[PDB]
Design an enzyme around this catalytic site. Structure first.
Site, PDB file in Angstrom:
ATOM      1  N   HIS A  50       5.061   0.833  -1.893  1.00 62.72           N
ATOM      2  CA  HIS A  50       5.603   2.141  -1.507  1.00 62.72           C
ATOM      3  C   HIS A  50       6.402   2.117  -0.207  1.00 62.72           C
ATOM      4  O   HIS A  50       6.666   3.156   0.396  1.00 62.72           O
ATOM      5  CB  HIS A  50       4.492   3.188  -1.422  1.00 62.72           C
ATOM      6  CG  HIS A  50       3.801   3.429  -2.729  1.00 62.72           C
ATOM      7  ND1 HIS A  50       4.407   4.084  -3.783  1.00 62.72           N
ATOM      8  CD2 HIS A  50       2.594   3.015  -3.189  1.00 62.72           C
ATOM      9  CE1 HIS A  50       3.602   4.058  -4.834  1.00 62.72           C
ATOM     10  NE2 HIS A  50       2.497   3.415  -4.500  1.00 62.72           N
ATOM     11  N   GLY A  51       6.780   0.919   0.230  1.00 62.76           N
ATOM     12  CA  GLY A  51       7.606   0.790   1.417  1.00 62.76           C
ATOM     13  C   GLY A  51       7.008   0.946   2.795  1.00 62.76           C
ATOM     14  O   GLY A  51       7.747   1.102   3.760  1.00 62.76           O
TER      15      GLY A  51
END
Ligand SMILES: [Cl-]
Ligand SMILES: [Cl-]
Ligand SMILES: [Cl-]
Ligand SMILES: [Cl-]
Ligand SMILES: [Zn+2]
Ligand SMILES: [Zn+2]
Lengths: 146, 146
Positions: free
Chosen positions: B107-108
């Site tokens: 999810h970065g």
């Protein structure tokens, strides 16, 4: 590896720490316990630790780094039970010449205070001594050395 | 506890050891990596490690006992994936102002080289630092402290 804190281990007491799911005993031996060890030699299977059941730095008369402490894996070399601790000298059940040690309740194997096995019991070898090293005077690292 | 031998861990390299089923990273940081850490502060959620994600002896600017090594649990605080290691400065995908760190591919989430989480990413907290202690200069015992 696991650290064993022996700062409070009094003379004659035994500390148990778990390493790799095995009980590792640390015993604070008195001069009296140490004085009696060589008298066991003639009755022991492997008094000189010729069988590789310990690191070389424990291949000696007390099977330890320092004479005051015995570090060993508390598992009988016969069928794997945990021997009882019998530090008292001459108890009636073990004989008047008993100089302290360990007694396995499963088949009667006897080991002295350097964890060396006596002749003619089911266990054929001395109890295993794990790799270990003192980090300082009251702390022993169990499971590794160097 | 698990022993991590960092005697061969070169500058900028990452060592992984398993502890309680979790990946524990040990990163050898260079003076350049260390020099850039304070610049991340304004962009970090918890630059001072106020959230208890580490032992007190790691509640500091480099979140470690010694500046040369970062010891942290390699599990993202968002949903548990293992972040990738991106020590290089300014790669195109992370921005020219990137000073090295970790990037979670799920999810970065971004974390710097003190494993501190940047603002506005899914992860809300700094990566967890386990209890640990140096047995000597090139040996760290994870899971135990003094
Ligand atoms: Cl047995
Ligand atoms: Cl037995
Ligand atoms: Cl995640
Ligand atoms: Cl994420
Ligand atoms: Zn037995
Ligand atoms: Zn993530």
């Amino acid at each position: 590896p696991v650290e064993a804190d022996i700062s409070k281990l009094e003379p004659g007491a035994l500390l148990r720490v778990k390493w790799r799911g095995k009980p590792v005993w640390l015993v604070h031996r008195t001069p009296e316990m140490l004085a009696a060890l060589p008298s066991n030699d003639p009755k022991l299977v492997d008094p000189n630790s010729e069988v590789p059941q310990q690191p070389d730095y424990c291949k000696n008369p007390t099977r330890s780094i320092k004479p005051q402490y015995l570090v060993a894996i508390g598992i009988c070399t016969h069928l794997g039970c945990s021997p009882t601790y019998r530090p008292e000298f001459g108890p009636d059940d073990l004989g008047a010449d008993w100089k302290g040690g360990f007694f396995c309740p499963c088949h009667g194997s006897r080991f002295d205070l350097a964890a060396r096995v006596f002749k003619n019991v089911p266990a054929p070898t001395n109890l295993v001594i794990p790799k270990h090293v003192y980090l300082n005077d009251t702390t022993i690292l169990i499971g590794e050395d160097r």
